[PDB]
Amino acid sequence: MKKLEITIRPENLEEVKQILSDRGVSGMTILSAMGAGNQKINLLPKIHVITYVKDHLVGNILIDIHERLSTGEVGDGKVIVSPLEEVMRIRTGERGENALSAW
Amino acid sequence: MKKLEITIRPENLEEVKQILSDRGVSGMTILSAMGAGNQKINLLPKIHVITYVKDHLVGNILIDIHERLSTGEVGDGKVIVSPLEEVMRIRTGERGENALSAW
Amino acid sequence: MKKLEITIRPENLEEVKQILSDRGVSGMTILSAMGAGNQKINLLPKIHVITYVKDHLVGNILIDIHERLSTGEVGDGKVIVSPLEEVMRIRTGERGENALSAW
Ligand SMILES: Nc1ncnc2c1ncn2[C@@H]1O[C@H](COP(=O)(O)OP(=O)(O)O)[C@@H](O)[C@H]1O
Ligand SMILES: Nc1ncnc2c1ncn2[C@@H]1O[C@H](COP(=O)(O)OP(=O)(O)O)[C@@H](O)[C@H]1O
Ligand SMILES: Nc1ncnc2c1ncn2[C@@H]1O[C@H](COP(=O)(O)OP(=O)(O)O)[C@@H](O)[C@H]1O
Known part of the structure; x- marks a missing residue:
């Protein structure tokens, strides 16, 4: 078994839930976060x-x-x-x- | 050394803190979350x-x-x-x- | 590649962002948390x-x-x-x- 960590734009959470259901995945745990990277240190809202x-x-x-x-x-x-x-x-x-x- | 990730009903946090103290465990970091799985996609509050x-x-x-x-x-x-x-x-x-x- | 998990006093987040930028690190995901340990079970605010x-x-x-x-x-x-x-x-x-x- 493996752990996936998927860090996304919040508007994409519905599509991540659908992708996991479409592969028979049983469940998921969702955390709110702030992220920094290439997008323009600017913090932006994320879902983890x-x-x-x-x-x-x-x-x-x-x-x-x-x-x-x-x-x-x-x-x-x-x-x-x-x-x-x-x-x-x-x-x-x-x-x-x-x-x-x-x- | 190992990492444990314990995903629970929030009402059970006191009992997880007591179990870890009863095994000499030094500490813990607590995150609020939303979870989906078998319980009836319905999101429910969780502690991670x-x-x-x-x-x-x-x-x-x-x-x-x-x-x-x-x-x-x-x-x-x-x-x-x-x-x-x-x-x-x-x-x-x-x-x-x-x-x-x-x- | 490796995952780092850095659990800190919230006032130290600016200095963690600067340390990672000073090593060319591309990004980071920040979660709010509560922690318990040696400091005086007392929960205190943390950043993960x-x-x-x-x-x-x-x-x-x-x-x-x-x-x-x-x-x-x-x-x-x-x-x-x-x-x-x-x-x-x-x-x-x-x-x-x-x-x-x-x-
Ligand atoms: N090195 C990293 N470690 C952890 N999270 C990262 C890292 N780089 C980016 N992220 C996460 O992914 C998000 C988007 O990354 P970003 O660099 O802006 O986009 P892209 O991957 O499209 O170049 C960030 O806001 C952050 O949450
Ligand atoms: N595959 C999974 N990956 C990550 N977290 C999971 C997974 N399945 C369940 N969970 C987490 O555990 C919680 C309870 O799971 P659930 O399936 O409802 O209960 P049970 O384990 O009693 O069948 C979920 O709300 C979610 O937070
Ligand atoms: N065994 C542990 N597992 C996970 N997080 C821990 C653990 N021990 C401490 N922590 C985290 O680190 C924080 C500070 O730890 P603490 O024991 O008070 O300080 P010190 O490391 O200076 O003795 C805690 O509030 C908690 O968030």
Whole structure:
């Protein structure tokens, strides 16, 4: 399993929720943020989306996010992929890929 | 050392602080969030807790969180475990497990 | 590439932005938080800064943060370093170190 961190323009949150639903993804945690980078130190409002996903889905999610969110204007955002050693569902104590099931 | 990310119902924050104190954990950083998943895309309020811990404590913290927070109702939340390559205390410049000491 | 998580007193955010600019770092995402630890469970306001950086810069950024932010008073904060498997720029679809370029 992998962690995705998706940092976007807030207006693009609906489209990120749809991309993850369209790949069977079970859930997501959304944080408000301020970001700085190339867009013109100017801070701008951002949404930071965290989702845990099965390893075979990551490549298609990254392609989907570029194809559907790109505006060709500076500031569209970033996606990173990082490793997960253990995942647990609090309600059941289930570990591994069972912890992300649709139920 | 490992990073835990604990995503919970906000009413359960007091019990997460007590579980970490009961395992000698030095600290925690708390973020407000909105989450989507199985509970009935409906966004619901969540707390996202980050804590850095010694590797031998992770198994007992995961057991404690399942045993004390489970309600057997959908939406109790998730815990993940991920790797840490370096940890530094800003005040002293100390690295490694010394950076998390109680002082 | 590596992820840094920098958890600080809010008054120190200007100095963290300057340290990252002084090492050529392209950007940063800023989250408001509450933290608990050694400082006197008392919750205190914090800023949580996430930045993605090239591996050869991490050692000098950690030294800079200790030298410029240390007050020798408990509560100055923490820096962690964690691994990144993939980085993508949404606007272009570019991966790897190209995804963090100044443009
Ligand atoms: N090195 C970085 N680390 C973390 N977040 C970054 C980094 N660079 C950019 N970001 C985030 O992505 C947002 C957009 O980045 P920006 O450089 O303006 O756009 P682009 O990626 O289109 O060149 C920023 O406002 C910030 O939230
Ligand atoms: N795949 C996921 N990635 C990240 N956060 C998730 C994921 N699935 C669920 N969550 C988080 O956990 C919360 C509860 O999940 P939910 O599916 O409703 O409960 P359960 O785990 O009891 O089936 C969500 O509101 C969200 O914050
Ligand atoms: N184990 C920990 N995991 C995550 N964040 C931590 C941890 N310990 C401390 N912190 C964060 O760093 C802040 C300052 O830590 P504190 O223990 O008061 O200072 P010091 O590091 O100077 O002893 C906390 O308020 C919290 O945000």
